[PDB]
Amino acid sequence: APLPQLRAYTVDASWLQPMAPLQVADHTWQIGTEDLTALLVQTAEGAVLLDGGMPQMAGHLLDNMKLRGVAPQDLRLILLSHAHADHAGPVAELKRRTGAHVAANAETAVLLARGGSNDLHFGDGITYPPASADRIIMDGEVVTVGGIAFTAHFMPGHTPGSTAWTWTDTRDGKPVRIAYADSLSAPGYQLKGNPRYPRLIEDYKRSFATVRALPCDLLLTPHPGASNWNYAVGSKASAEALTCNAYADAAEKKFDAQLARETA
Amino acid sequence: APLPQLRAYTVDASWLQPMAPLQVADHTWQIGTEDLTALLVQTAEGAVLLDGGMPQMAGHLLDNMKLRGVAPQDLRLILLSHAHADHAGPVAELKRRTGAHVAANAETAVLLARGGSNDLHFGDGITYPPASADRIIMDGEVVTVGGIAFTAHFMPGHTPGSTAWTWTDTRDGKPVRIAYADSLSAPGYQLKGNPRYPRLIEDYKRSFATVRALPCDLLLTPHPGASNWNYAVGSKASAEALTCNAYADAAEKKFDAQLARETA
Amino acid sequence: APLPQLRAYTVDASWLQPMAPLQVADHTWQIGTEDLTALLVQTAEGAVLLDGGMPQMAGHLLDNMKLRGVAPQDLRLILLSHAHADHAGPVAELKRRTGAHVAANAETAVLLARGGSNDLHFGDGITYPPASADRIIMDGEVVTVGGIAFTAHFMPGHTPGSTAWTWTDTRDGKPVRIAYADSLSAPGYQLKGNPRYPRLIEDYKRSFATVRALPCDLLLTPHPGASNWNYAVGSKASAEALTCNAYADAAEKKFDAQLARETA
Amino acid sequence: APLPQLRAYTVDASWLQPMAPLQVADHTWQIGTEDLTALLVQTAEGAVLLDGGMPQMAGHLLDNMKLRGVAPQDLRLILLSHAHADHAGPVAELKRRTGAHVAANAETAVLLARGGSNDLHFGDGITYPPASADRIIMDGEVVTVGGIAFTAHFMPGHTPGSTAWTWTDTRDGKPVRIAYADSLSAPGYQLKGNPRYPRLIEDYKRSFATVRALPCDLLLTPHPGASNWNYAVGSKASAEALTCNAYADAAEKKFDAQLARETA
Ligand SMILES: [Zn+2]
Ligand SMILES: [Zn+2]
Ligand SMILES: [Zn+2]
Ligand SMILES: [Zn+2]
């Protein structure tokens, strides 16, 4: 009776479907896949990448950056929503090939440093190549690259270091407040009485109100389905997108229903 | 005109005055100096150390542990209030000579990993040898060593990873709730409008209420003067010690007065 | 055309076949699987573990240690041959559950810190949970635990930080020089003109002579087949075991033949 | 009798005397102090910095880079001779303000990661702010930035990760082979029978022959006095500079004389 073999982290085929760079605003572009968000912000002093998706997406991300006229050495900063393999996967490889830095809070830094291993809920089942954080950001700290200011908003829940990023871009000169909020789900999490996360419910409830008050004109999520985005239709991608109130209120209803059946 | 020389972190002579192990409870001992707290908890499965003081105190700590019949390999865990040089100093040296592990939250871990350098308020002026954290603890997580359970209580303010530790010991069988709360001061900190700590005031106010509600029968602080402890008098050390309400209420008055004159 | 899914590191079923602790000397025991070596050294002051095998072997290792009367807190030190997933796999999990420290050289430390990712020859195909090294050892440095001295012998080749460990045990009082040498193979390695390892051939040739001169009465390897060990037969396990000269001379013949056909 | 206070790492005033950028070749510039070498290499795709000097030199280095028309974001890579405070000091601060990466071998990486603490010969007396390595280089590995190729040459002795860097620049089109070799001294080192460095003598002897065979037309050292450089005289700085043979042969005579009197 041999010990069980290792099992790889497999996802849906739509999570790995490459797409051409879809434009969100004057300086914001989606360069990930159909069901994984990878935001690129082109500035006058360099590019900024928010999340990266699965670890095997490092090559696809570099191709879309070259399509936007962005050399590897032009990527200046990598920002993360939360350090899971399906979002912070190719961060290690992108640091070696682009010369970019990674800015994340302490909780995301320690999770990214160990490659998602020893997860509070998943253990070692979802492990990705480890990467180090070059700058530790605090709640509400502003990060500026090429004149565009990125403000961090801590929303602990899915991970202790979940962060929503807000910045103001333009749409043919007319400004737009973009808010890239993280996930608010808890797939298979032990919500009540978790020894690894005793204050989990208090963090989710405080994060639901944090998402509601985010300065936002266009909402984006790491998984586009959470905010009712459809990258496949291109022009009509942001047609039925949800607000910050609708996204937080819908996630709280699922949280309370999951918390209620957990006690059953 | 040569560049200025480096300056060492010098403290008062009382902070470096060795003392014999002063007993606090049946299993708790003070093995630091007169003005620096180093709590040792002897259990049936090993010893636990809370803080260590200045970096040059590693030799004095090992001597007092040997006086208590504790070999270096018997030290099982090191706990920290906050990762500053005057408390988490000899942590790196103690890990090499005792085989103990360090448990701290993410904010204390990233601060301990870089040896206090790049401080949010002090910069590189107070640098100590770096040490790594072996276990990342969350708010309210319980750590048990030899039957004694240590509960973490996050109180961000002095540092983002300030932690108060509470545990129940005995006094000749009669139990006692000990609460080792961290400092609540802000020496020379920019309280309002700090770009490195935008939510500093919100963290201090929330930490003041956290200290008030701590389960406590005997309060101890990293600096014994903050809780009106006097290690020099030995038997009368805990005579005029402050409560949790008195300690938090007195620190908030100084915080508001400092915040008021800062706006002046 | 979706991007290819991730693939897990699968091995032979014999590499994951648990076995009872097989005795090697008075204080040395094999507690791994049939085709993976995990040496345990019981001393008067604690236990020492050399390698651990696949990452999913952490539970099996703790069971055999309990069979030998070794509690988790009794494991004092973990030693490694080279930081690959099939040997240094459960190191991260064993550190969290045993309170042991890890001693390895700089090259093994930086490879263990990133969980085998960014391998010089394998890339990210063989990734395991990352672990940190607590003590950096040099070539020829002696490590003593409970009176038994372990001497490190650098043999760079399979990995830049491959290390052979030698120590003197007994066999009913009669001493025996045990040498736990690392692998000398190069599976699919680019030997000549490797940009990631320009001095690869010089390191292998210098390592072949290092293995020949190792003080050895009984040779063991991470893979027992390399030294002609057969853990399955129990008593006759060390019957046809190879010497240090035979093991190094046979590995060099395969190295030269592989280097010759590589130029073809 | 209080414990002794901490003492800062003080150096000569000439080690902290700022100087204007002195030109070495068409693309190589000295931007450090009079007695500390800080080489800057301006390419078409960015700048490369070799060493930095004392930790308090980060501001002076950025000023000279601005004089050479090099913005902070233009610094692409930082190379190190050995990770001591008087050479790798401002590396941590330069990474935060320039967005550059650090390339060093495993031994320099683990020494830079702990800020020079726990030195093999100095202990914790010479501690500097810690910095992380982004790329691990091997012996003879080539690093190219903007067409200029930097080849690493391991020369363990002063530190286990001492590295000499060689590259070919020009002098008005006429090429010149520059070799930036590390120090070969051992100030107060225990050469024979050192438990922290058992193979110290073998590494020094092998490093002396390594420096002799370095491809070199102009030699530079971290301390300009070792190679008979005089940055103060400007034009006549490289007048009486030593060769690679003269520098290695003079250092070996001092090594043997120091090794001889150590046995006395
Ligand atoms: Zn997800
Ligand atoms: Zn203090
Ligand atoms: Zn193997
Ligand atoms: Zn020097």
From TrEMBL, chains A, B, C, D:
<dbReference type="Pfam" id="PF00753">
    <property type="entry name" value="Lactamase_B"/>
</dbReference>
<feature type="binding site">
    <location>
        <position position="82"/>
    </location>
    <ligand>
        <name>Zn(2+) 1</name>
    </ligand>
</feature>
<feature type="binding site">
    <location>
        <position position="158"/>
    </location>
    <ligand>
        <name>Cu(2+) 1</name>
    </ligand>
</feature>
<feature type="binding site">
    <location>
        <position position="84"/>
    </location>
    <ligand>
        <name>Zn(2+) 1</name>
    </ligand>
</feature>
<feature type="binding site">
    <location>
        <position position="87"/>
    </location>
    <ligand>
        <name>Zn(2+) 2</name>
    </ligand>
</feature>
<feature type="domain" description="Metallo-beta-lactamase">
    <location>
        <begin position="35"/>
        <end position="223"/>
    </location>
</feature>
<dbReference type="InterPro" id="IPR050855">
    <property type="entry name" value="NDM-1-like"/>
</dbReference>
<feature type="binding site">
    <location>
        <position position="223"/>
    </location>
    <ligand>
        <name>Cu(2+) 2</name>
    </ligand>
</feature>
<dbReference type="GO" id="GO:0017001">
    <property type="term" value="P:antibiotic catabolic process"/>
</dbReference>
<dbReference type="GO" id="GO:0008800">
    <property type="term" value="F:beta-lactamase activity"/>
</dbReference>
<feature type="binding site">
    <location>
        <position position="158"/>
    </location>
    <ligand>
        <name>Zn(2+) 1</name>
    </ligand>
</feature>
<keyword id="KW-0862">Zinc</keyword>
<dbReference type="InterPro" id="IPR001279">
    <property type="entry name" value="Metallo-B-lactamas"/>
</dbReference>
<keyword id="KW-0046">Antibiotic resistance</keyword>
<comment type="similarity">
    <text>Belongs to the metallo-beta-lactamase superfamily. Class-B beta-lactamase family.</text>
</comment>
<keyword id="KW-0732">Signal</keyword>
<dbReference type="GO" id="GO:0008270">
    <property type="term" value="F:zinc ion binding"/>
</dbReference>
<dbReference type="InterPro" id="IPR036866">
    <property type="entry name" value="RibonucZ/Hydroxyglut_hydro"/>
</dbReference>
<feature type="disulfide bond">
    <location>
        <begin position="216"/>
        <end position="244"/>
    </location>
</feature>
<feature type="binding site">
    <location>
        <position position="84"/>
    </location>
    <ligand>
        <name>Cu(2+) 1</name>
    </ligand>
</feature>
<keyword id="KW-0574">Periplasm</keyword>
<feature type="binding site">
    <location>
        <position position="86"/>
    </location>
    <ligand>
        <name>Zn(2+) 2</name>
    </ligand>
</feature>
<keyword id="KW-0479">Metal-binding</keyword>
<dbReference type="GO" id="GO:0042597">
    <property type="term" value="C:periplasmic space"/>
</dbReference>
<feature type="binding site">
    <location>
        <position position="87"/>
    </location>
    <ligand>
        <name>Zn(2+) 3</name>
    </ligand>
</feature>
<feature type="binding site">
    <location>
        <position position="223"/>
    </location>
    <ligand>
        <name>Zn(2+) 3</name>
    </ligand>
</feature>
<dbReference type="InterPro" id="IPR001018">
    <property type="entry name" value="Beta-lactamase_class-B_CS"/>
</dbReference>
<feature type="binding site">
    <location>
        <position position="86"/>
    </location>
    <ligand>
        <name>Zn(2+) 3</name>
    </ligand>
</feature>
<feature type="binding site">
    <location>
        <position position="86"/>
    </location>
    <ligand>
        <name>Zn(2+) 1</name>
    </ligand>
</feature>
<protein>
    <recommendedName>
        <fullName>beta-lactamase</fullName>
        <ecNumber>3.5.2.6</ecNumber>
    </recommendedName>
</protein>
<feature type="binding site">
    <location>
        <position position="87"/>
    </location>
    <ligand>
        <name>Cu(2+) 2</name>
    </ligand>
</feature>
<keyword id="KW-0378">Hydrolase</keyword>
<feature type="binding site">
    <location>
        <position position="82"/>
    </location>
    <ligand>
        <name>Cu(2+) 1</name>
    </ligand>
</feature>
<dbReference type="GO" id="GO:0046677">
    <property type="term" value="P:response to antibiotic"/>
</dbReference>
<feature type="binding site">
    <location>
        <position position="86"/>
    </location>
    <ligand>
        <name>Cu(2+) 2</name>
    </ligand>
</feature>
